[PDB]
Amino acid sequence: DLASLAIYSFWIFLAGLIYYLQTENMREGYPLENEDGTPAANQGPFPLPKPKTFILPHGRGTLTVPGPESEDRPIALARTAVSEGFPHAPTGDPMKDGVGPASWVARRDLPELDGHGHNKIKPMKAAAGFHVSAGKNPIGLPVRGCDLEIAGKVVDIWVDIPEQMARFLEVELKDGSTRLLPMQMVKVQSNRVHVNALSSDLFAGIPTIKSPTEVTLLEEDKICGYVAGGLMYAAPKRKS
Amino acid sequence: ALLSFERKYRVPGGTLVGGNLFDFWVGPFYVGFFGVATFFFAALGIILIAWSAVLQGTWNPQLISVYPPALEYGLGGAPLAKGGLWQIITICATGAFVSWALREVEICRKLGIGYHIPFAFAFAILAYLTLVLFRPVMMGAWGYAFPYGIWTHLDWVSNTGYTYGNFHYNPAHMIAISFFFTNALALALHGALVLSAANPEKGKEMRTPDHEDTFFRDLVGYSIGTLGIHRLGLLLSLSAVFFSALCMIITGTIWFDQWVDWWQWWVKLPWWANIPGGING
Amino acid sequence: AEYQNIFSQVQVRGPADLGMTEDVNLANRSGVGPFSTLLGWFGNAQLGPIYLGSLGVLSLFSGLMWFFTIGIWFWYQAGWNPAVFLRDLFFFSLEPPAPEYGLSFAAPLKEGGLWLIASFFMFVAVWSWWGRTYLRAQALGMGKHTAWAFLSAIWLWMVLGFIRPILMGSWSEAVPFGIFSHLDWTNNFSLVHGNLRYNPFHGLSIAFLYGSALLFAMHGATILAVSRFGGERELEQIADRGTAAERAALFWRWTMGFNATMEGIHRWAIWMAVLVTLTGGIGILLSGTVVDNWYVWGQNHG
Ligand code: BCL
Ligand code: BCL
Ligand code: BCL
Ligand code: BCL
Ligand SMILES: CC[C@H]1c2cc3[nH]c4c(c3C)C(=O)[C@H](C(=O)OC)c4c3nc(cc4[nH]c(cc(n2)[C@@H]1C)c(C(C)=O)c4C)[C@@H](C)[C@@H]3CCC(=O)OC/C=C(\C)CCC[C@@H](C)CCC[C@@H](C)CCCC(C)C
Ligand SMILES: CC[C@H]1c2cc3[nH]c4c(c3C)C(=O)[C@H](C(=O)OC)c4c3nc(cc4[nH]c(cc(n2)[C@@H]1C)c(C(C)=O)c4C)[C@@H](C)[C@@H]3CCC(=O)OC/C=C(\C)CCC[C@@H](C)CCC[C@H](C)CCCC(C)C
Ligand SMILES: COC(C)(C)C(=O)C/C=C(\C)CC/C=C(\C)CC/C=C(\C)CCCC/C(C)=C/CC[C@H](C)CC/C=C(\C)CCC=C(C)C
């Protein structure tokens, strides 16, 4: 009857939907490659989807996916086994080379813009009207790393104007230069800011930015990748 | 095979047990010590279920059902053919689940990401343990746990529910449902928002997260923000499951009468208990 | 130590944001309300402004009328006595007109008419609100995803109190406006139909409701897990993939063998949720009209 017809129809619709959804989720990272970078023999039952184009705002251009995929940077890694499926060891310094949990992506070297075309993230000292409205104000607190040594002090907070949210802390090292630290990787306390991901001797290694008033998508990745990588790589210096 | 950007992430390290011994992949799947443990507990578990199918005298997927020890055996051991198998498969299930969570923990470490996912999965494990371990023990018998069968586990739900009348009247159950409904409201709203911003009116340019905040402030006068919504979604989900576990652990333990009667307390309050009219007087 | 990013550590505030203009008639956009420091700990602290055009006022008015119509009825039942009102608040109920009246609109005010009046207000309140979700998106030039997904919820609601009572032939088939009574109606509905556990659509609907909690738990936890690389800025990660999007995809591929993309995951989302009430609506719609006993039906599949 009608019911058995409906459920039968529904199961067919569902299969078509799952198919449609999986193909839509293949717009990045595909085709699959072998560890050497050449296309792999087996790609799966799902065909690559027909390209779509995004019209970026603010005259930033266009993006078409799927499209030509390339890292656009060298990868300091070497094989550790004569067969695939094994880890690739870093040939140099993983933190500096940006590999493993220290990896960064070659994103455009321009800052993210808000709806009006202005820079989304700015140091608070340039964001007129912004101020700390609740919680402990970090500006002035010394910064301590996982090795219990002080590496510097917070000289400002970089805010997200559109979404009124603190995103970075600007820290000044012993040499007088500053570095940015992701908000989600620091613990603000009553008498200090603690950074577990890094040890004092590693703060100077954080990637520096070009302009003192803006961060680009590319520099954000390099800084966030670097500080995330410390959990594994700075581990031997983490005496706690 | 690897995704186009995957190689740089496949570095060694992050394992909780065994060092480099199991630090490898099989296709897209990462292994690790807990990858082997999961496999072990899983294989042994399916075998017991097949063995159970023979003893039950069926091979049909809809018919196979592994029942727990009958109330008579208490919190003790029962013969394989009636409760024993269930007990061991339950140990295997617990082992598989906990191993899975830890596998996720190792994958987090290697990728250098937070542990939020494994943490969220643990609430699921908690709810399962509440039904087959915590409640049964507090009620003094494995017999109160549900059977491992596609249709049979549904009978259990109905029978356990109706044992206290209409289970709707369980206060905690009421709360758990509200979160399950709200979570779906939020999941629908979130998916729709991001997509409406990424796929604007034909020919136009991509909207920004500012357009998203504006849309929600125009619609209901408030926007929780891009970070808030992911914090909200995680919270609604874990709450729905927390209250579900709570609603069942209080049932048959501290409260074993009809759930509808529980509400009399409010109606019986002194100051209004004796006033003619309405519905209760 | 170990910051989870569930709650903000520090709060920042700047001038109230009036939002993007686009084609929005700014004459209908109210002023900004107060800033909530409480809410600011979890998400945004700003309240308002809110756009309130004609369709909004209509919706907002019909809604109060619906709520108020049910309200005076509860009062009448409470013998106007405030103590009784608060005591029996959950037991009160505004029932549909008796089966004898069928689909007629000529039922006494005290025995069905008020319910028909309340329903009319709710009907207007809900449909005007839908039209509103479509227009607020248009004025900003964004897709209509929110309006279509909302329609999925309207479906089940439309079926429960309008489409089904109509096909059955009487308003008595509808849901009563009462907290405890609508729970009773749900239980009664299952029993009268041979137990909904045998309705395959009910079973699917449940799979999706459970699936939605599974997915949002997975999604939310994933985003917070990568918030340290700016993961919540989903739109920009779609336009220019960052390490946040890569690590998120890789965690999943290594765990279960496959993954999604920043944009792709929101497609799984909107569908997982929308299917809950879509399948459900069909299951309810067939109950009583075509299949009068699901257990029987499930036996011969006739
Ligand atoms: C789905 C199949 C059944 C059914 C079965 C059930 C069952 C079973 C249960 C409910 C429950 C509820 N049902 Mg019902 N329900 C149906 C159809 C409906 C319809 C409808 C228009 O069709 C409505 C309006 C409701 C409404 C309601 C609520 C009273 C309650 C929670 C809903 C929710 O979580 O929304 C979430 C979405 C929101 C936007 C939130 C709305 C506002 C909330 C409810 C209150 C304000 C909270 C505030 C914002 C924050 C806190 C403030 C402080 C307290 C001050 N039901 C049909 C007939 N319903 C539960 C209950 O507790 O009943 C008593 C319950 O256990
Ligand atoms: C006739 C039935 C009774 C009733 C009886 C019960 C009873 C009895 C129970 C509930 C429970 C629930 N009820 Mg009730 N309930 C009724 C009507 C309703 C209505 C309704 C609209 O009328 C609704 C919305 C609900 C909603 C709910 C939820 C709050 C809850 C189920 C979710 C849950 O517990 O997740 C919990 C999640 C899990 C257990 C999942 C665990 C997953 C594990 C960890 C991993 C699996 C791995 C693996 C096997 C997967 C496959 C692997 C392959 C490789 C692919 N009830 C009526 C009144 N209700 C249940 C509950 O609250 O449980 C605590 C419960 O026991
Ligand atoms: C004893 C009870 C029966 C039973 C009878 C029913 C009945 C009857 C129904 C369900 C339905 C559902 N059941 Mg059941 N169900 C049982 C056992 C279960 C079990 C269980 C663990 O065994 C579970 C998990 C469920 C789960 C579910 C859901 C999948 C589904 C509701 C979807 C929904 O989101 O509605 C919530 C959402 C809506 C109603 C949409 C609302 C849209 C409108 C536009 C909102 C307007 C709001 C506005 C007016 C403001 C409100 C203000 C208020 C004052 C707050 N059932 C047993 C067998 N169940 C429904 C279904 O779809 O069946 C197929 C249904 O009708
Ligand atoms: C949660 C509260 C109640 C309960 C109440 C209900 C109700 C009510 C219903 C279900 C339904 C389902 N339940 Mg149950 N169920 C419970 C506990 C469980 C557990 C468990 C380990 O705790 C499992 C594995 C299941 C599994 C299942 C599926 C057969 C089915 C769809 C689930 C779904 O879509 O979720 C969402 C999850 C996903 C989309 C992820 C994929 C999960 C897959 C589909 C799980 C496959 C399990 C497999 C067949 C058996 C185990 C693995 C094998 C041994 C290899 N239930 C407890 C006792 N269950 C529905 C049904 O149709 O059953 C006939 C239904 O109507
Ligand atoms: C796909 C189905 C799922 C879903 C989706 C869904 N719902 C939706 C949408 C979507 C995609 C919307 O876009 C739409 C929305 O506007 O969200 C913000 C909506 C919506 N889903 C809602 C509720 C809702 N949805 C439900 C369920 C579901 N919705 C499913 C989970 C339920 C359940 C579980 O039964 C409820 C209760 C609304 C918040 C909203 C529809 C708004 C609406 O139509 O209102 C009309 C107008 C009135 C009722 C008048 C309001 C007058 C105000 C003054 C009231 C203010 C609140 C009041 C409590 C104050 C009282 C006084 C105080 C001092 C205490
Ligand atoms: C916060 C709670 C919510 C949630 C979240 C959640 N679930 C999760 C996660 C998260 C965050 C994961 O990271 C994890 C995942 O990896 O998903 C892809 C997972 C997961 N949630 C799953 C299922 C699931 N979650 C459920 C519920 C929920 N999960 C909630 C809604 C349900 C419900 C709704 O019923 C189910 C069925 C799995 C797909 C997956 C975990 C997979 C796993 O643990 O692998 C190890 C085990 C095996 C491969 C098989 C073991 C086989 C045997 C040893 C036993 C088999 C028999 C069994 C014990 C009984 C079967 C009886 C039934 C037929 C009745
Ligand atoms: C404090 O006291 C005052 C008076 C000040 C108050 O404000 C009190 C107010 C209350 C006590 C309000 C209480 C509100 C509730 C408890 C409401 C509960 C409602 C439910 C739980 C409802 C559940 C389900 C309802 C459904 C499915 C309704 C469906 C409606 C329809 C689809 C509409 C169909 C339309 C019809 C029949 C009429 C069509 C007419 C035409 C002319 C086209």
Ligand SMILES: CCCCCCCCCCCC[N+](C)(C)[O-]
């Ligand atoms: C709810 C589950 C829905 C189906 C999910 C799995 C679909 C097939 C995924 C294949 C992924 C393949 N791969 C690794 C080659 O890309």
Ligand SMILES: CCCCCCCCCCCC[N+](C)(C)[O-]
């Ligand atoms: C009553 C059925 C409701 C189905 C809702 C489906 C929502 C799909 C949203 C994505 C498709 C959007 N689009 C481009 C057509 O607007």
Ligand SMILES: CCCCCCCCCCCC[N+](C)(C)[O-]
């Ligand atoms: C897009 C995700 C799709 C997930 C589908 C999950 C289906 C679970 C099995 C449902 C079985 C239903 N039944 C009994 C009605 O046939």
Ligand SMILES: [Fe+2]
């Ligand atoms: Fe998202």
